[PDB]
């Protein structure tokens, strides 16, 4: 057939390229940087009314400064999850402290091109890792399986990502408040979903200095929702 | 401390006249502690007879491990093994340890299915054949078997007669022996019967 | 050692080993996985191409991991083993060191791991195999049903269904399955997981097999003559 | 074609294809200026952003204390380059109380590259490289490809539209090469090359990336408003 | 070293004392034989420090992945095995290791597991460790009660380990009190040996023998 | 049989102040009854402000420094030039020490510097990597000599205030960088008189917020 | 873990004002049998450093021949190999530290101990120890074996600390050398007569004398001492 | 640990099985069961040196309920302690040896025959009428041979082990602080509570 | 490089299917009929051998019919060399089981132990699979006598009577005919070889075209026997049964 670390003529890796399309298939994640907090938000899209939308867990806890939203083959997350899960206890164990945002980044992105014939192909999922560390603040990364990490002040992954991009571009600004960008995350992602957003087939997370790492209620977030509707309706 | 020496027990082979014997005690023990009294040593393939002397765990790993051989040997050979191939089968498994040994004393016995044939036969732990014409012994009163065996034995003894000399030779052993004894067990083999034989003796 | 990528991604963003898999499970037999209020029932599929068998020795399709756990599965049969042998082993593994037995959502991540691995792992292909999960947490009430595929995700389910045919016996579930009142007691869940096999099974004969799982490590498997009654009752109600 | 499936494959005509694509690769990548005096080496990083809330990707990457490079082209395999050269650099101060001659250095990139062109299964690197450091024989500048081809130089540029960034320098030759004992002059000089490659967008002050060593400057990194001043 | 904790109606008291010697040489007075291994879990130190040190600090890194795996607060039953295993992979290699894994859950309630670098692990209601640490059993089992109050059993941690500072050569510097609850534990001071012996035998009466 | 183990003698000091650090230490190296050097120095700064010693044998002890020092040079490689911090230094160096649990460093080691909030920091450490922040720490040969002394004079321990016949103790007021280089100096002024290891040299390293300086200062070379 | 066989005594050293003077005696013992007469344990590398070794003569020659090879390797792909990036002292010397110290930690060590003496490129002297277990030292004097109890202390009254240095001229620093050479032969009962000699000056760069002997010896009051106490004929 | 015994009466097995554990100086426990169910009728006891004993058991545990699971059927006791000496007898020759004796006391359910099976650490398996371990036989064996028939009741059982633990307790200088008893017969296991 | 030439043993067809499993049944096809029939007092196993020679040694030949143990035997239908590979493999299974338990191996366990074999060379290993197909015929003291199948994929079915090899689709049908549960094995004896007379491809079934076994409790007292018939005593059964 043909080699899995193969260059196009282009200059570019067939199997990674390729990757990249199971990630737009992947259901909308959405992250945004403020100065108060990181939020991450995702569309859960169930595949039946009988699946228990709450088992499905599409923003993850990496340790208590940093969080984790996935979008694309979300079963290739797993080990990601736990490599950074790993590297973030292990350093706070040979260093007592937390780890930079940045450096765990570095290292889960460390993994994707271990690929040959190590795994056999990329991963088909695109993180975004959100939090805070002392040095740099707030914090917002979008790891691919290309092996590159760009960080941002707001991002969008998945299905409805150049949309949504598009959104965020006008929308962001440096001094967005953290509830303000919870409705944008809510606004934005009811644009691009298929179905009607709700507090049951969408969920909302955030890390913040005091509290950390936390994924919303679906009673937290319901109400984060009728706030939105008044508030478009007000004009 | 000697794992020959632990558990005690005796084994002792003689051949007589279109036939062979082979007998055993029945003690196991640890050290001065009389553990078991049903403790057999002497186990058979077919009719191929072995006895097992020395370290208890040993001997049941052994037997296991020649059952299991014998077993596959069967399968593939389609008959049964003889007693002058179990003999070079025993050396070579006792040999393949030759670093790392089976504290054990066996004494291998039967006759020739083909040839009818007496055969005996004894190695040290470590697998050097002793092919004997006239008898095998083994055990933690071997020098004492070897004195027994000298004067008793001669040539040539019908099936019954040969059944009172390795009895006597056995029980008189074992009773100047503190580790052997509590029991003992006589086979008489022939070409197509067997007969097993337990010994009344002092329990002390 | 043999190292070749079999699963790998294509120009359009798809790993065609890992749907092809799926299409292992789509002509294995139906398997279907309804919990109550108190309770989950797993109904299979037996194809009655095959007469003459040894019921008593034949593999059941349904398989108990632990006491309290049990996993049946739609696809590649001799896969399925490979599965439930790892399943079983860890369940033991983590009683050892945690000192309590797995709940029912470890026990299918780690399955769903296994199967993700082999997706992109050097010189193995996928499982032919996608299985539910069913059982109780121990020291819990609450009834506990998953579902696994070839691709390595799993999710929670009400009521779910997996094999040939699993489209139709699924329309079934949808429309007849209420969340807000589960089938309340053993009977209602068992009726419920029978009606849905009678949608595709053909003759509701040795064809249906029925395990219940209660709380507590109260596991049994139901004879023909009981699902038979399940069967008859059925269509009586239906003649009107 | 037929040729272009491994790079243990060579064409009838004596070309390695894969190495050539991962030469493509650089191309596409964002432009980056090396220059070199006497007494100082400068490197000078068009960073690229993905968009308008996202970052700019980091281009420069310190060895030691006495050397780094600019990449151009896969991000991944320049970490894993300048990674080795970290180690290298460090063998040579822990076993030898040695710092690492930039000559040797390329010696080393050159030959770890060399590896992956004639083996199955790996492939070539996606990433050039511009070495700049002081050592025990002065100031020097490397180029770094893929290939394995590594090259000394007074002043090169890497990446997409470098040829104009290229050019400029080697008619600049005689002046820059003089800018001794003075170094935001080599900076300037090494700014108003790499503005030769730019086109529709200009250098803003999260958008430009500068380095330096000397005679008596360590390695150091300018970033943000640090190079604001060069603008 | 003097290390004691016991179970009763208020959780877990844990009470260490803070003497390090090297033969007959005191190394130190301030050293801390209660590791933190998290807001809820405590370790005691005895035998080898660093043995102690190092691998109940791994053993707090193992139960924060446990709890982001599982999102379920590690029972003191499995943090205390997962130690127990560890150390048994290096039976014979020479880790000297004796210390009690203590913490309070749902499930379980307030739990003590002794464990040992021979590879022993022994859940129990009253554990002694270090080479005073007959002098503490003894103030220990004579006024040990379950329905004992908090304040009491304190008290009751302290004196042991006073005991035992008093007699036991290789014991001494200071008291290190903690009191072990369902939220976690907390902290109780502090205090010099040599202020408090004068202190508690002028109040209670004891030690008629010195003088003071 | 060969003994990978030798003693090279030596003894160091490490005092934490308020808002400063001084670890101190004799230049003289040995072997058995003969002097190596009458200059060899022992305490080593280190990089982001820590200064550290590991006493004992000097091969290992030469070892541990250029391993942590590396170590300082990896963690700005690994997370952004990020300043490593004395505890984290601390933590770091458990891990070396204890990497070689079961053959062990045979050294004392001791590092000074500044915590997070500017006040004065000293951390001790066993062979085999058991540690704990301190404000007093002696180590090596003459520490049984130094560490009473300083218990008497820094932590004034056994004094009480006159006319209250030891109701009342005697209150521990800071000490000034001046006041502590004085206890250092007569500590090893006394070592080296009753010490035959102890002498020729003393060599402090002091840690501020502004940085590391040095005072070199004679010893009897008896 | 290994037991010395063929050995040799005592290598001393000492810096003065330009440079360092390093020497020992040509001397391959094997016990107390003194069997190698004509044995080398100074060994130049380059034209700037002299690498002085006592202890286990086999590891001696293993030793030899990596820092010729080393040599061989330095020049590889070097065309400053004889000027800017030419082997220096200190190069060579934490290259052996490096080796010892991870000899001994193998458990295995080579049985040595090591003096490099030389000249570095900015006209610093460098005088530097290693010995099996991989201990490092400096000082202005440095001697091993029975030089360390006897000739040390004769070196150490001309250089007694690093202000004497620049005070001790290259004639003074060989007369001292020379001097401690003759009490070690009068008193090491491992020693030899016959000893080489080596000079690293930053002006006139290595001079490396050999079969120099101890001559000028006190032998004569021999013939007075009768007996053991009593004793007078 | 200390003392184990075992004896095999009429229709069930008796392990009694001492509560002390000593960690040198100090008695750390006196309510300690040295004993882990098998199988729903499988027993075994267990006695030898720290940690090795309860890793050990444990282990075996783990095995034999892997084996229940996977064949939905309960092995033998004889099936049981034969996997059980494999692995003493593999445990002897290894780098660091499992230092552990084992009773296991059965209720063979196809046979309907209780089963005392006695393995010490170097795999010396004996299939006995009552047994025991370390120096427990010792002083407690000669009555056992005086008093013990095939055909004892459970109660006679408990009486022959009421005399042989006072006997213990009279000439033995450790104090081993009791015996937890339990009997395994054919409805499965069960402690004596009042010992 | 070398993937180039790689068959890729292991993997799925678009429809779901492992190619090499699929052809290996095709390959089995071609072999050899092997019948296995269980009654309530015993199994019986009977096979044809594939056009033979008239100078082909039959007394000492075994191409159909092994034996595992004393308690199981095997009938094959495929490739007798990978076959005696896998023969082997169950022999060493069944003696690791006895010295381990010193108990005889029950036979689902050396049935599935087998089937996973054949199992892993489906999945992973870039091998060709096994081109066998066993009949399993054996007795163990919990299901007492019990007949499986297994084939290249690694799966196996529980049987009361089965076929395997040529003609099984023919074969399967008269046995689903003629079988009933409280059938004897002198009965079932009859059933096999009146089977294979009708779906063989050759003229006529004779003695020298045949393997036969049987597994009996028809042995003294208590015990399983097993008998692979001799050339004379499978011609003598033919006689009995009124096919010669
Ligand atoms: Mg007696």
Redesign the pocket.
């Known amino acids: 057939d043909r080699g899995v670390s193969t260059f196009s003529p282009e200059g570019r890796l067939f199997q990674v390229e390729y990757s990249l399309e199971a990630i737009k298939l992947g259901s909308t994640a959405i992250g945004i940087a403020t100065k108060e907090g990181v939020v991450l938000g995702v569309e859960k899209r169930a595949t039946s009314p009988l699946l228990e939308s709450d088992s499905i867990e599409k923003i993850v806890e990496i340790d208590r400064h940093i969080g984790c939203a996935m979008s694309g083959l979300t079963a290739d997350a797993r080990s990601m999850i736990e490599h950074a899960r790993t590297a973030a206890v292990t350093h706070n164990l040979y260093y007592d402290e937390d780890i930079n945002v940045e450096s765990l980044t570095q290292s889960v992105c460390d993994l994707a091109l271990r690929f040959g014939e190590l795994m056999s192909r990329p991963f088909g999922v695109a993180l975004l890792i959100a939090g805070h560390d002392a040095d740099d603040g707030y914090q917002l990364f979008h790891a691919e399986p290309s092996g590159t990490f760009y960080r941002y002040n707001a991002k969008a992954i998945g299905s409805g990502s150049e949309g949504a991009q598009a959104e965020l571009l006008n929308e962001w600004h440096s001094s967005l408040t953290l509830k303000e960008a919870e409705l944008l995350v809510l606004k934005i992602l009811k644009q691009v979903m298929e179905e009607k957003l709700d507090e049951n087939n969408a969920q909302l997370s955030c890390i913040t200095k005091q509290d950390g790492f936390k994924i919303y209620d679906n009673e937290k977030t319901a109400e984060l929702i009728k706030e939105l509707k008044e508030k478009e309706a007000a004009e | 401390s000697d794992p020959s020496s632990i558990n005690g027990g005796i084994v002792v082979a003689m051949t007589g006249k279109d036939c062979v014997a082979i007998a055993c005690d029945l003690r196991l023990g640890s050290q001065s502690l ?1 553990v078991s009294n049903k403790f057999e040593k002497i186990f058979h393939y077919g009719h191929v007879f072995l006895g097992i002397t020395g370290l208890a765990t040993d001997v049941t790993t052994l037997n296991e491990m020649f059952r299991y051989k014998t077993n596959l040997y069967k399968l593939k050979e389609e008959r049964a093994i003889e007693p002058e191939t179990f003999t070079q089968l025993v050396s070579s498994s006792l040999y393949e340890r030759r670093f790392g040994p089976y504290f054990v004393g066996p004494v291998v016995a039967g006759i020739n299915s083909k040839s009818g044939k007496p055969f005996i036969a004894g190695f040290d732990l470590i697998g050097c054949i002793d092919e004997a014409k006239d008898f095998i012994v083994s055990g933690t009163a071997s020098d004492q078997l070897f004195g027994m065996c000298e004067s008793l034995y001669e040539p040539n003894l019908e099936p019954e007669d040969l059944f009172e000399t390795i009895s006597q030779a056995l029980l008189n052993a074992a009773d100047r022996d ?1 580790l052997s ?1 509590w029991g003992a067990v006589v086979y008489i083999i022939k070409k197509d019967e067997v007969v097993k034989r337990y010994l009344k003796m002092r ?2 | 050692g043999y190292d070749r990528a079999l699963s790998i991604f294509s120009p359009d963003g798809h790993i065609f080993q890992v749907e092809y898999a799926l299409e292992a499970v789509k002509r294995g037999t139906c398997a279907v996985g309804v919990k109550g209020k108190n309770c989950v029932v797993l109904g299979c599929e037996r194809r009655s191409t095959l007469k003459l068998q040894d019921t008593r020795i034949t593999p059941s399709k349904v398989s108990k991991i632990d006491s309290h756990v049990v996993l049946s599965f739609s696809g590649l049969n001799a896969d399925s083993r490979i599965l439930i042998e790892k399943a079983r082993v860890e369940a033991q593994s983590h009683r050892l060191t945690l000192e309590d037995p797995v709940t029912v959502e470890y026990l299918t991540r780690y399955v769903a791991g296994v199967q993700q691995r082999y997706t992109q792992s050097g010189g193995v292909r996928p499982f032919g195999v996608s299985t539910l999960i069913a059982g109780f947490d121990p020291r819990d009430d609450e009834p506990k049903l998953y579902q696994t595929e070839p691709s390595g995700i799993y999710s929670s389910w009400s009521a779910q269904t997996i094999g040939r045919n699993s489209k139709t016996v699924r329309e079934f579930l949808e429309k007849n399955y209420d969340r807000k009142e589960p089938p309340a007691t053993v009977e209602e869940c068992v009726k419920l997981t029978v009606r849905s096999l009678l949608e595709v099974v053909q003759t509701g004969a040795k064809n249906i097999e029925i395990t219940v799982v209660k709380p507590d490590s109260d596991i049994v498997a139901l004879s023909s003559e009981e699902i038979n009654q399940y069967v008859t009752q059925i269509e009586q109600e239906k003649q009107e | 074609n037929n040729y272009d499936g491994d790079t243990v494959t060579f064409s009838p005509t004596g070309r390695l294809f894969q190495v050539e694509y991962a030469l493509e690769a650089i191309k596409q990548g964002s432009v980056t200026v090396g220059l070199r005096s006497n007494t100082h080496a400068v490197l000078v990083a068009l960073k690229r952003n993905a968009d308008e809330l996202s970052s700019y990707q980091k281009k420069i990457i310190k060895c030691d204390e006495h050397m780094g490079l600019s990449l151009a082209g896969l991000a991944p395999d320049a970490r894993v380059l300048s990674n080795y050269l970290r180690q290298q650099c460090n063998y040579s101060s822990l076993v030898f109380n040695r710092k690492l001659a930039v000559e040797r250095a390329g010696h080393l990139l050159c030959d770890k590259a060399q590896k992956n062109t004639q083996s199955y299964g790996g492939r070539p690197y996606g990433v050039g490289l511009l070495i700049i450091g002081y050592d025990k024989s002065g100031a020097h500048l490397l180029e770094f490809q893929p290939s394995g081809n590594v090259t000394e130089l007074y002043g090169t540029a890497i990446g997409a539209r470098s040829q104009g960034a290229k050019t400029y320098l080697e008619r600049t030759l005689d002046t820059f090469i003089k800018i001794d004992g003075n170094p935001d002059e080599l900076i300037k000089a090494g700014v108003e090359a790499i503005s030769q490659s730019l086109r529709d967008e200009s250098l803003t002050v999260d958008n430009l990336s500068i380095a330096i060593v000397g005679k008596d400057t360590p390695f150091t990194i300018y970033d943000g408003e640090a190079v604001a001043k060069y603008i | 070293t003097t290390t004691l904790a016991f179970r009763f109606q208020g959780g877990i008291i844990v009470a260490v004392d803070s003497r390090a010697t090297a033969g007959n040489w005191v190394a130190s007075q301030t050293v801390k034989k209660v590791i933190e291994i998290n807001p809820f879990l405590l370790g005691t130190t005895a035998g080898g420090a660093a043995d102690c040190q190092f691998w109940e600090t791994w053993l707090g890194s193992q139960c924060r992945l446990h709890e982001l795996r599982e999102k379920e607060r590690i029972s003191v039953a499995a943090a205390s095995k997962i130690l127990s295993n560890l150390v048994y992979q290096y039976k014979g290699a020479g880790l000297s290791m004796g210390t009690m894994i203590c913490g309070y859950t749902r499930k379980e309630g307030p739990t003590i597991y002794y464990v040992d670098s021979d590879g022993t692990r022994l859940k129990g209601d009253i554990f002694c460790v270090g080479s005073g640490q007959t002098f503490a059993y003894g103030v220990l089992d004579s006024n040990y009660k379950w329905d004992l109050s908090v304040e009491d059993a304190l008290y009751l941690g302290k004196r042991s380990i006073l005991a035992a500072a008093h007699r036991d050569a290789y014991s001494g510097g200071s008291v290190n009190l903690y009191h072990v609850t369902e939220d976690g534990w907390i902290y109780h001071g502090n205090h010099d040996v040599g202020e408090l012996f004068w202190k508690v035998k002028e109040e209670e009466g004891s030690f008629n023998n010195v003088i003071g | 049989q060969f003994n990978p183990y030798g003693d090279n003698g030596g003894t160091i000091l490490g005092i934490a102040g308020e808002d400063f650090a001084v670890l101190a230490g004799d230049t003289r190296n040995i072997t058995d009854y003969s002097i190596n050097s009458r200059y060899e120095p022992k305490v080593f700064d280190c990089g982001d402000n820590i200064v550290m010693s590991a006493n004992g044998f000097a091969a290992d002890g030469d070892a541990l420094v250029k391993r942590f020092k590396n170590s300082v040079k990896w963690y700005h490689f690994d997370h952004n030039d990020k300043k490593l911090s004395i505890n984290s230094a601390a933590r770091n160096i458990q891990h070396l020490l204890y990497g070689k649990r079961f053959f062990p460093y045979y050294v004392h080691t001791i590092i000074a510097g500044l915590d997070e909030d500017g006040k004065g920091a000293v951390y001790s450490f066993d062979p085999v990597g058991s540690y704990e922040r301190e404000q007093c720490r002696a180590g090596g040969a003459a520490a049984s000599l130094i560490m009473p002394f300083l218990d008497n004079q820094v932590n004034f321990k056994n004094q009480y205030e006159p006319g209250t016949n030891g109701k009342v103790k005697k209150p521990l007021k800071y000490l000034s960088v001046e006041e502590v280089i004085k206890l250092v100096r007569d500590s090893f002024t006394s070592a080296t008189e009753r010490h035959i290891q102890v002498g020729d040299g003393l060599e402090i390293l002091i840690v501020t917020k502004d940085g590391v300086r040095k005072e070199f200062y004679e010893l009897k070379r008896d | 873990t290994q037991q010395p066989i063929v050995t040799g005594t005592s290598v001393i050293s000492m810096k003065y004002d330009n440079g360092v003077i390093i020497a020992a005696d040509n001397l391959g013992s094997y016990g107390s049998l003194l069997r190698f007469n004509g044995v080398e344990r100074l060994i130049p590398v380059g034209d700037n450093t002299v690498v002085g070794i006592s202890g286990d003569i086999s590891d001696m020659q293993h030793i030899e021949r990596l820092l010729k090879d080393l040599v061989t390797e330095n020049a590889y792909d070097n065309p400053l190999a004889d000027a800017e990036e030419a082997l220096e002292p200190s190069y060579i010397f934490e290259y052996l530290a490096t080796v010892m110290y991870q000899r001994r930690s193998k458990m295995n060590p080579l049985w040595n101990a090591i003096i490099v003496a030389g000249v570095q490129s900015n006209g610093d002297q460098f005088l530097r120890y290693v010995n099996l277990l991989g201990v490092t030292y400096s000082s202005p004097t440095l001697a091993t074996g029975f030089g360390a109890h006897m000739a040390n202390p004769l070196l150490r009254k001309v250089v007694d600390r690093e202000s004497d240095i620049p005070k001790t001229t290259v004639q003074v620093a060989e007369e001292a050398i020379v001097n401690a050479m003759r009490v070690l032969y009068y008193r090491d009962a491992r020693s030899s007569r016959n000893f080489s000699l080596a000079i690293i000056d930053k002006n006139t760069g290595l001079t490396f004398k050999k079969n120099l002997q101890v001559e000028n010896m006190k032998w004569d009051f021999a013939k007075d001492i009768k007996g053991y106490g009593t004793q007078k004929i | 640990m200390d003392i184990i015994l075992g004896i095999r009466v009429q229709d069930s097995v008796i392990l009694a099985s001492s509560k002390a554990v000593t960690r040198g100086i100090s008695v750390l426990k006196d309510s300690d069961d040295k004993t882990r169910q098998l199988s729903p009728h499988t027993l075994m006891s267990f006695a030898g040196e720290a940690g090795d004993t309860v890793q050990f058991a444990e282990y075996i545990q783990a095995n034999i309920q892997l084996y229940s699971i996977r064949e939905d059927y309960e092995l033998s006791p004889q099936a049981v302690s034969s996997f059980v000496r494999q692995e003493l007898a593999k445990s002897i020759r290894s780098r660091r040896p499992y230092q552990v004796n084992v009773l296991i006391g059965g209720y063979d359910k196809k046979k309907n025959k209780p089963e005392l099976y006695q393995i010490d650490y170097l795999g010396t398996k004996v299939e006995l009428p009552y047994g025991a371990h370390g120096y427990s036989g010792f002083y407690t064996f000669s009555l056992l041979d005086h008093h013990y028939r095939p055909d004892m009741t459970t109660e006679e059982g408990l009486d022959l082990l009421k005399l042989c633990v006072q006997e213990l307790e009279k000439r033995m200088p450790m104090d081993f602080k009791g015996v937890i008893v339990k009997i395994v017969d054919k409805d499965g296991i069960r402690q004596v509570d009042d010992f | 490089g070398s993937r180039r030439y790689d068959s890729r043993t292991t993997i799925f067809s678009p429809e779901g299917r492992l190619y090499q499993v699929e052809y290996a049944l095709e390959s089995i096809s071609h072999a050899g009929t092997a019948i296995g029939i269980m009654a309530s007092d015993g199994i019986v196993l009977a096979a044809e051998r594939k056009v033979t020679s008239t100078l082909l040694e039959q007394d000492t030949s075994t191409e159909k019919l092994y034996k595992l143990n004393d308690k199981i035997a095997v009938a094959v239908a495929g490739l007798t060399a990978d076959a005696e590979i896998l023969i082997n493999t169950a022999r060493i299974h069944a003696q690791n089981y006895l010295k381990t338990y010193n108990e005889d191996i029950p036979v689902e366990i050396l049935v599935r132990r087998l089937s996973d074999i054949k199992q892993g060379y489906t999945q992973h290993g870039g091998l060709r699979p096994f081109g066998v197909s066993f009949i399993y015929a054996g007795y163990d003291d919990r299901y007492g006598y019990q007949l499986y199948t297994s084939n290249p994929s690694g799966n196996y079915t529980g049987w009361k009577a089965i076929s395997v090899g040529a003609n099984t689709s023919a074969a399967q049908t008269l046995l689903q005919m003629d079988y009933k549960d409280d059938m004897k094995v002198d009965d079932a004896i009859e059933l096999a070889l009146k089977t294979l007379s009708k779906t063989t491809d050759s003229s006529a079934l004779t003695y020298d075209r045949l393997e036969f076994a049987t597994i009996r409790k028809g042995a003294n007292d208590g015990e399983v026997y097993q008998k692979i018939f001799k050339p004379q005593e499978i011609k003598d059964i033919l006689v009995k049964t009124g096919i010669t």
């Open positions: 009389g503190a004894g329990q002390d």
